[PDB]
Ligand binder design. Structure first.
Ligand SMILES: Cn1c(=O)n(CCCO)c(=O)c2c1nc(Oc1cccc(OC(F)(F)F)c1)n2Cc1ccc(Cl)cc1
Ligand SMILES: Cn1c(=O)n(CCCO)c(=O)c2c1nc(Oc1cccc(OC(F)(F)F)c1)n2Cc1ccc(Cl)cc1
Ligand SMILES: [Ca+2]
Ligand SMILES: [Ca+2]
Ligand SMILES: [Zn+2]
Ligand SMILES: [Zn+2]
Lengths: 525, 305, 108, 673, 78, 78, 172
């Protein structure tokens, strides 16, 4: 059909998908309009991604299906209807909520009733935790954070205990997981400061101060990430950037452990005599990079807070546009760096100097090789490269002038044109995403909540290492969802009678009606 | 206003019925003058009544820019819309005093052309109205030439351009993004083989590979990337004692480099000769290519000297 | 302190202005590049570097007559479905009602 | 299967031809055909009078939505079943509520909506008046911090139903028409209801926009009710109603910014401000600053004249609120001039004799500041003191002054500058005095509220300071992460051999990353480019460690300068776009607060000099206030009725009503002929 | 109490049922019934010509918002 | 700028610069042309105000009340 | 009266100034509605300056008066009518009055700008129609030959070179 008539085939597919995605057909003929709406929104999103033509119609259709699902949830008026909708499964589960989270239905989850049910489940067995003074909230969060190990060992000893069931509350579970991570960060911060030994040992023996306490927690992290790779699939793992950074951090910790035990078993002398590629130095640097990756995970902990969760979510939204512009910056940087290298690399000098490169007391050989030129042009954005790098030790004034001109031109670009373009583009992007920040934050917070809702992973990171029932559920879901469909079509017809709109067709309709009545009267009378 | 004929007002209210009864009565509007016409009349009407003359010209060009009058009395409404949009943009450039009105009429002509092409149903009809000259795409070449932004951004025209651009492998869009990436890569590696096999045997399937315009763009981008890699290779192999000796000497890399330079200057000559010079000067990319070629030619001339 | 931040404000308004007509401009430039590469004039990379007219005009006239008919119908459909009633249309309706009432009084 | 079959899963009871014809006859509006249909239904029982359309329209409901009353009377003649049809007539704003009230399953409305709640939701004056006349009572909502057994039992049984009931009740109470009918004092009821709804919006994070919209609606209703005033006597009666400007102080306490910034209240405040004056707004600018200076110098004369005898004409000149504001500003500027004289004019004294040339005059001002802040913190509420950030700045500067004078007294009574201890009390006293001087001279931003140009800018700054704090939290976390990591890699390259200046504050920057404190300081200073690149050098010949340190420092620069610091600019721009629309109202509210801080006599002398029948009257005030409020409510009701029908937009049910009317007239003509 | 009592504190003026029928017929734009009502209002009846609604809608003002020229002429006539 | 440079004074750059009947005729000409201007203006605002305007609730009330009054007049006649 | 009822007096003055600033009353009762619009706009601006409260109402009234003046300029349809209006005086005296009273809507009228561009390019047609390089060349050769035209009109004012300084574009 594409080879015969491509336009006819594409328009036919668009009309078929526009007919299937109508709210009325879905509410009348589809047996499971929630699942039908979810699958149709997903399929129209894939059609918009694949068919770059007709993309606006496809994303409008997907938005219309999401609108239909949100309105259908808005037509609920009882808690039991919400419980029988969200816990319904095809074959406390919240299976439909899991599937709606999977299908990226943002305004479905961010509905007030679903938020109310999830907040009721989140503060399990809590006599009005939200109805508290903020100071009392702070001290009670502090005291659940402090007693994390006693609740952990209470769950390990007696699961039936009230303290053993205290960790099963998702809020207390989240508090204890944050306490474990904060204690891990405090252990690393002590590892930076408590260390006061020779720091000259050739092999770097593992101390009992911080090591063997970082080690278990690291392999507990590894086991947890392996479990989340197995449970939920690889696609859900790579969908979130936070899990990718967690995997990178765990790989760096494993590399540091491997390098440290290699230094224990091999090459076991002043510190200045070490080679630049010694295994202990590589372990040191990899531990440092893993530490700067581990201490940034507290940003992922900030989606739960109401005052700044939308802010963190908005920054996460426009980070992609930041990378979008950094590609253009990389092209400019490569262009000017290799141009300046092609100019100055005939003037390479050593002269037995103490230091070479830009990172010396006096800058020299800045534009010597391509690596040094890229480093020197990168640091020029922040002004840490002085102006005496552009002149040569010889007296070739013309090459010095054209090198300074190229350097100044690149500085003008990457400090007036591209940075201010980035500011304006960020301005428009945050203006666009300011309206959708609330539903995005609610969706991310519900994903974080439902991460802790499952039975598995209850233990924290120290201790990580039938047909009749189906028919009854189907009939309950069918009767509740029939009531929902009837309420939704009544409300949609009422809104159709409510919208402030009168075309010129209806004035002509009244005119034709009154003229017909007049002509009937004149025919009769 | 006293200068307004009934047919001009009929085109102003844009009703098709009033037009289709009025032009049955053998009605013709006055012909407006050119962009810079300063004849014995045009230099006298400005002296006579400048505001009256300007309002008469605006009324005439609002009468002509109506979609009803374009669709009724012209041989080709698409061509009339293109020419009228270009003429109205030029007048808005000239007539500083009425920039908004002439710009709005140009926008209305462009929108009419966009919608008139949007009423195409069959792909055969789209091919007919895009290949018309007074795969060849002469009408689309005119539409890009006349700077019609709405005409070419239409879904049907863009879809036809996608089917022409992708060539034989129309399922390339059906492929996932990883498969598109590795397909682009594996064409980017063996591009000289494809160019040579086209230069030798264009009859076979690899001979017809280069006639795919997406593929032609891929070998063109890979050729420029190979030129860039040879440029880095010059500095990586800059050890012909040139760092010290005064007299320039050309290596194999510089031989290939000047071969690429004469190839790019030959492509520049072909662009200047087949398409012209003004459209070359319009594009900033072609200006960048010209300054690049002048700089490289001066570099090699000074090297030889 | 002054000129650079003024430039930032000017660019903020400008990028607010282009961003609505952004996809159309990008598609137009992409199509310009595509039609530049559509020719058979130079297919090699830089290193390698009449009654038929009347029949075509008749086919084009048929296709354009069909397109004009469809666009006229679509334009009148959109026009009748988009414009809003104004007070003058109300005035014609009051006129029709009063003309009914006066004809009824005159007849009776 | 190459084709999707379709079927009606949601099967209804459908319609027989006769019942469908009858429903269509009610839809058209025929009197005789529908009358004949019910006469046939009465004695032959072929069709049912209480029939249901497939989408849910019983004949009473189509007769409601077509807004005619003849078929209402006819359908109620043969006793057609009525359920929520009273609610449907209420939401359609029909005058058939009397017909439906006087007579004797699937419900679109929730079962928790009684008719008065829906009447208040629709905000129709006649329907609410009719329902209150008929006799009805809205259920009383509980406290916004109520934890009673009934509340938790209702939340356990159905939490969604209870939350929807609370929202419906608070939408019913917040309607302007119900407040105009029922409340004894509409202004006090509006203020208390706005405060209650804002507290519920804080408590209920869910349904937050609904409660915020309700509070905005209540404040707007109070604003328009004040807008309908037409005399100065009525305004002075309203704003001075106690139970002076007592109601204006109450409106300030309830933070009604739309009520306070109302223009006629601003006229009354300006009249109380520039009292017995020739007109400051009708004056030349240079003359205005000249006379500002001329009451600036004459501050001590008026102050001591009020001190000895307030009944003097010069002792009554100070009593005007503008004059005492000028006197307080002049006293503060004299105090800052004394601070500048202390800085410019003042060695090796270890014990540090206090500079009696200047400091003997500064200390009375400090005592006056302490007395004023203590009096404001105790007398005048507690939480409103801590809500104001300038009062927190006063508390900080007063604590610093107290610590400075305490340390100086201690060092004087018990104790070569280069030979001093690093924690010497004189040096700490000097540092605390310098920081307190910063706070004291930064307090002058609070005086820009009285100005007519810098006021909106200062108010716009004070609204995004909290948002700045929100971004500074994220930056602080990023700073902590990168600082801790850089401390890890370099801790062991600590070069301290004979350098004589260890840190970043020397000519040669050394050991910038050798400890967590110095790493935090050096990464803070890298925003402004004051940290050179050679701070990432170690004393050894290691290279990979240098490169990892340099790439971590660069990554921090990128994150904190290109990403975060430019995110902040865009977020500020959005915040200022959101703020500047309401900047005039907030500036007028803050200026009113500053104005009536000087209105009362609770402190008339400036800062450095201040250390030296009833039932019948209440009945008269209540009667005058009730008459004025009756006039105001009548005017507001007439104005709201007029504006409501002025702009409606003509929703399509009006055109459907028009078609049904014309069809009914045509059918009546057919019946008559 | 757990229920808020509702009443009209400012009860304002009240109308007779005949006055309400007069005002409703004026709102409907009726010739015969309004003319008859004013005719019985000429003799001593309950119906007062200057009937004012608590909404401030006199039959004069209602006919002004009714725009019926014949009705406003009838009302100014008596 | 243009009208500052339109004046006969200052024609030299800074280098080298170192009746009743007529009034009545002008008054009558200005008056006549501005009668024409105000006639065109009131025609324009009458035309503009007759279109791009929302009918809202009052126009529907008038239009429905005319049909109601017409129906009652017909019922009175027949 | 302000001491008795300041609110009623301020509302009275606002109502009177809203009645006077109505375009229909200006077009129906004023001798010179352009002069009335100018004076009323200036009075409303100074009233909004004096009355800091009710400033938005007076600014709206002044903008309404300026819009009325701009519309009354829109209704013209001849250059003769523009020359009658703008040169009226009791020389573009009315345009001087619009400049002085800060009527940016009146001044930036397309017809008024047409007259101003005609008077600015005195007997200089086709200046915008000619090429940008050509017109910049003409500007450069007029500005380079500046002493010969400026020495003229100082010794020989009636010379064609002396009358070349009469054109305001050449003067600029
Ligand atoms: C590109 N460029 C440059 O490289 N150098 C360094 C050369 C060796 O020092 C310069 O000094 C230099 C320069 N452009 C310069 O003028 C600008 C033009 C456009 C933009 C701009 O900047 C910004 F975008 F507005 F911010 C600056 N100037 C200053 C200059 C110097 C000499 C002369 Cl005759 C005229 C101008
Ligand atoms: C984090 N980082 C860094 O630390 N150094 C210092 C290393 C030792 O000096 C760098 O040189 C360095 C660097 N990121 C770099 O590329 C960027 C890419 C994208 C954005 C960006 O940010 C901003 F747009 F500029 F703001 C910077 N480069 C430049 C570079 C150097 C070598 C190579 Cl092969 C490739 C790129
Ligand atoms: Ca994870
Ligand atoms: Ca204070
Ligand atoms: Zn001509
Ligand atoms: Zn309770």
């Amino acid at each position: 059909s594409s080879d015969v008539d491509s336009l006819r085939h594409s328009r036919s597919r668009l009309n078929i998908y526009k007919a299937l995605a109508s709210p009325s057909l879905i509410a009348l003929s589809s047996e499971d309009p929630f699942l039908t709406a979810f699958q149709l929104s997903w399929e129209l999103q894939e059609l918009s991604k694949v068919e770059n033509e007709f993309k606006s119609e496809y994303e409008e259709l997907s938005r219309q299906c999401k609108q239909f699902a949100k309105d259908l949830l808005d037509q609920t008026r009882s808690s039991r209807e919400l419980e029988i909708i969200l816990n319904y499964r095809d074959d406390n589960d919240l299976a439909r909520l899991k599937l709606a989270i999977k299908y990226r239905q943002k305004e479905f989850v961010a509905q007030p009733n679903c938020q109310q049910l999830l907040a009721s489940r989140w503060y399990d067995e809590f006599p009005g935790w939200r109805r508290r003074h903020w100071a009392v909230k702070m001290v009670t969060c502090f005291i659940i954070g402090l007693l994390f190990p006693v609740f952990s060992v209470c769950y390990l000893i007696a699961p039936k205990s009230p303290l053993g069931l205290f960790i099963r509350k998702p809020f207390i579970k989240f508090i204890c997981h944050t306490a474990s991570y904060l204690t891990f960060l405090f252990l690393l911060l002590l590892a930076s400061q408590h260390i006061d030994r020779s720091d000259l040992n050739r092999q770097g023996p593992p101390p009992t101060i911080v090591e063997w306490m970082i080690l278990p927690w690291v392999l507990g992290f590894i086991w947890g990430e392996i479990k989340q790779m197995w449970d939920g699939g690889l696609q859900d793992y790579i969908h979130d950037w936070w899990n990718l950074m967690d995997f990178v951090m765990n790989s760096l910790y494993l590399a540091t452990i491997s390098l440290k035990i290699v230094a224990f078993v091999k090459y076991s002398n002043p510190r200045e005599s070490w080679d630049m590629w010694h295994p202990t130095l590589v372990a040191e640097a990899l531990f440092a990079i893993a530490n700067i990756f581990s201490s940034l995970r507290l940003i992922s902990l900030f989606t739960a807070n109401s005052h700044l969760g939308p802010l963190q979510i908005s920054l996460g939204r426009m980070l992609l546009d930041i990378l979008k512009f950094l590609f253009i910056y990389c092209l400019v940087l490569l262009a000017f760096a290799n141009g300046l290298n092609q100019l100055y690399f005939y003037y390479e000098e050593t002269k037995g100097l103490t230091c070479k490169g830009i990172r010396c007391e006096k800058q020299n050989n800045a534009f010597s090789t391509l690596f040094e030129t890229l480093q020197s042009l990168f640091w020029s954005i922040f002004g840490l490269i002085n102006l005496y790098v552009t002149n040569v030790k010889a007296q070739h004034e013309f090459t010095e002038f054209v090198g300074a001109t190229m350097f100044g031109t690149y500085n003008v670009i990457s400090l007036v044109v591209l940075l201010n373009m980035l500011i304006a583009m960020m301005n428009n992007s945050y203006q666009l995403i300011a309206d959708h920040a609330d539903i995005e934050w609610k969706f991310a917070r519900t994903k974080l909540w439902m991460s802790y809702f499952e039975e598995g992973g209850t233990l924290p990171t120290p201790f990580n290492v039938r047909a009749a029932d189906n028919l009854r559920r189907h009939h309950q879901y069918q009767e509740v969802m029939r009531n929902l469909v009837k309420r939704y079509v009544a409300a949609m017809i009422r809104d159709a009678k409510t919208e402030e709109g009168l075309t010129e067709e209806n004035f002509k309709e009244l005119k034709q009606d009154i003229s017909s009545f007049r002509f009937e009267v004149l025919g009769l009378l | 206003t006293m200068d307004v004929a009934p047919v001009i007002l009929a085109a102003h209210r844009n009703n098709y019925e009033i037009l289709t009864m009025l032009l049955k009565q053998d009605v013709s509007l006055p012909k407006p003058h050119a962009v810079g016409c300063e004849c014995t009349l045009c230099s006298a009407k400005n002296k006579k009544d400048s505001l009256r003359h300007s309002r008469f010209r605006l009324d005439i060009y609002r009468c002509l820019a109506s979609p009803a009058l374009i669709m009724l009395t012209e041989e080709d409404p698409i061509l009339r819309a293109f020419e009228l949009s270009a003429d109205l943009k030029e007048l808005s450039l000239v007539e500083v005093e009425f920039r908004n009105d002439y710009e709005e009429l140009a926008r209305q002509c462009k929108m009419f052309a966009k919608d008139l092409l949007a009423q195409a149903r069959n792909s055969r009809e789209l091919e007919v109205i895009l290949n018309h000259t007074s795969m060849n795409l002469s009408r689309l070449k005119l539409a890009i030439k006349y700077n019609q932004k709405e005409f070419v951004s239409q879904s049907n025209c863009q879809q036809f351009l996608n089917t022409v651009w992708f060539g034989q492998m129309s399922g390339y869009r059906r492929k996932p993004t990883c498969k598109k990436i590795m397909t682009v890569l594996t064409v980017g590696i063996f591009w000289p083989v494809l160019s040579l096999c086209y230069l030798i045997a264009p009859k076979s399937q690899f001979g017809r590979i280069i006639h795919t315009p997406f593929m032609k763009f891929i070998i063109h981008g890979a050729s420029y990337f190979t030129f860039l890699l040879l440029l880095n290779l010059y500095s990586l192999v800059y050890n012909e004692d040139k760092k010290n000796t005064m007299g320039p000497a050309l290596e194999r890399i510089d031989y290939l480099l000047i071969l690429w330079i004469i190839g790019m200057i030959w492509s520049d000559i072909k662009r200047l000769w087949y398409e012209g010079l003004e459209d070359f000067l319009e594009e900033s990319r072609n200006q960048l290519s010209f300054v690049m070629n002048s700089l490289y030619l001066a570099t090699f001339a000074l090297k030889v000297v | 302190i002054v000129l650079t931040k003024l430039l930032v404000a000017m660019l903020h308004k400008s990028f607010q202005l282009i961003a609505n007509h952004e996809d159309k401009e990008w598609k137009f430039a992409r199509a310009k590049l595509w039609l530049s590469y559509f020719d058979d004039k130079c297919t090699l990379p830089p290193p390698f570097n009449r009654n038929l007219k009347q029949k075509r005009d008749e086919n084009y006239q048929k296709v354009m007559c069909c397109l004009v008919h469809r666009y006229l119908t679509s334009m009148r459909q959109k026009m009748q479905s988009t414009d809003q009633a104004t007070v003058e249309n109300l005035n014609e309706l009051r006129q029709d009602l009063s003309k009914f009432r006066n004809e009824i009084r005159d007849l009776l | 299967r190459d084709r999707i079959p379709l079927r009606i899963v949601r099967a209804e009871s459908e319609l027989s031809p006769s019942e469908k014809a009858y429903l269509n006859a009610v839809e058209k509006g025929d009197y005789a055909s529908v009358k004949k249909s019910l006469e046939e239904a009465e004695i032959y029982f072929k069709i049912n009078i209480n029939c249901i359309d497939p989408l849910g329209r019983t004949a009473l409901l189509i007769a409601i939505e077509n807004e005619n009353l003849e078929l209402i009377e006819l359908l109620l003649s043969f006793n057609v079943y009525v359920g929520d049809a009273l609610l449907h007539a209420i939401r359609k704003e029909v005058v058939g509520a009397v017909e439906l009230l006087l007579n004797h399953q699937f419900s679109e409305f929730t079962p928790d909506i009684t008719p008065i709640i829906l009447a208040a939701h629709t905000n129709n004056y006649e329907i609410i008046k009719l329902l209150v006349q008929k006799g009805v009572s809205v259920p009383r909502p509980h406290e916004v911090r109520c934890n009673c057994v009934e509340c938790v039992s209702s939340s356990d049984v159905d939490s969604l139903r209870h939350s929807r009931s609370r929202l419906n009740i608070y939408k019913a109470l917040a309607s302007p028409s119900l407040i105009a009918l029922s409340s004894e004092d509409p202004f006090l009821t509006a203020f208390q209801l706005s405060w209650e709804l804002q507290e519920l919006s804080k408590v209920e994070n869910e349904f937050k926009s609904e409660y915020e919209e309700l509070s905005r609606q209540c404040k707007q209703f109070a604003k328009d009710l004040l807008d309908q005033t037409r005399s100065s006597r009525e305004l002075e009666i309203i704003l001075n109603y106690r139970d002076d400007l007592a109601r204006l102080k109450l409106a300030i306490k309830y933070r009604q910014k739309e009520f306070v910034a109302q223009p006629n209240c601003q006229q009354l405040l300006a009249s109380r401000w520039y009292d017995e004056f020739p007109g400051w707004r009708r004056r030349h600018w240079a003359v205005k600053m000249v006379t500002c200076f001329i009451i600036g110098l004459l501050f001590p004369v008026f102050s001591v004249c009020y001190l000895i005898a307030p009944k003097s004409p010069l002792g009554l000149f100070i009593r005007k609120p503008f004059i005492k504001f000028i006197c307080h500003t002049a006293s503060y500027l004299t105090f800052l001039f004394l601070l500048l004289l202390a800085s410019q004019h003042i060695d090796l004294n270890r014990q540090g004799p206090p500079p009696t040339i200047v400091e003997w005059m500064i200390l009375p001002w400090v005592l006056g500041f302490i007395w004023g802040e203590i009096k404001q913190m105790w007398d005048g509420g507690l939480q409103d003191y801590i809500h104001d950030w300038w009062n927190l700045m006063d508390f900080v500067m007063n604590s610093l002054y107290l610590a400075t004078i305490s340390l100086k007294i201690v060092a004087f009574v018990k104790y070569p500058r280069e030979s001093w201890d690093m924690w010497h009390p004189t040096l700490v006293a000097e540092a605390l005095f310098a920081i307190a001087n910063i706070f004291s001279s930064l307090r002058l931003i609070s005086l820009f509220t009285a100005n007519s140009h810098l006021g909106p800018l200062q108010i716009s700054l004070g609204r995004m300071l909290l948002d700045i704090l929100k971004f500074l939290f994220i930056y602080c976390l990023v700073l902590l992460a990168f600082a801790n990591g850089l401390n890890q890699l370099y801790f062991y390259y600590e070069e301290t051999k004979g350098l004589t200046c260890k840190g970043i504050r020397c000519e040669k920057q050394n050991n910038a990353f050798s400890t967590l404190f110095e790493t935090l300081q050096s990464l803070f200073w890298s925003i402004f480019g004051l940290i050179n690149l050679y701070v990432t050098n170690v004393k050894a010949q290691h290279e990979f460690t240098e490169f990892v340190g340099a790439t971590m420092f660069g990554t921090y620069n990128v994150i904190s300068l290109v990403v975060l610091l430019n995110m902040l600019i865009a977020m500020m721009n959005n915040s200022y776009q959101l703020i500047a629309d309401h900047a005039d109202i907030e500036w007028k509210f803050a200026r009113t607060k500053l104005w009536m801080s000087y209105f009362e006599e609770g402190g008339t002398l400036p800062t450095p000099f201040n250390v030296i029948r009833r039932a019948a009257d209440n009945l008269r005030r209540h009667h005058q206030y009730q008459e004025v409020m009756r006039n105001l409510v009548k005017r507001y009701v007439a104005a709201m009725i007029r504006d409501a029908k002025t702009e409606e937009g003509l929703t399509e049910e009006n055109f459907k009503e028009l078609k049904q009317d014309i069809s009914s007239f045509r059918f009546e003509v057919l019946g008559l002929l």
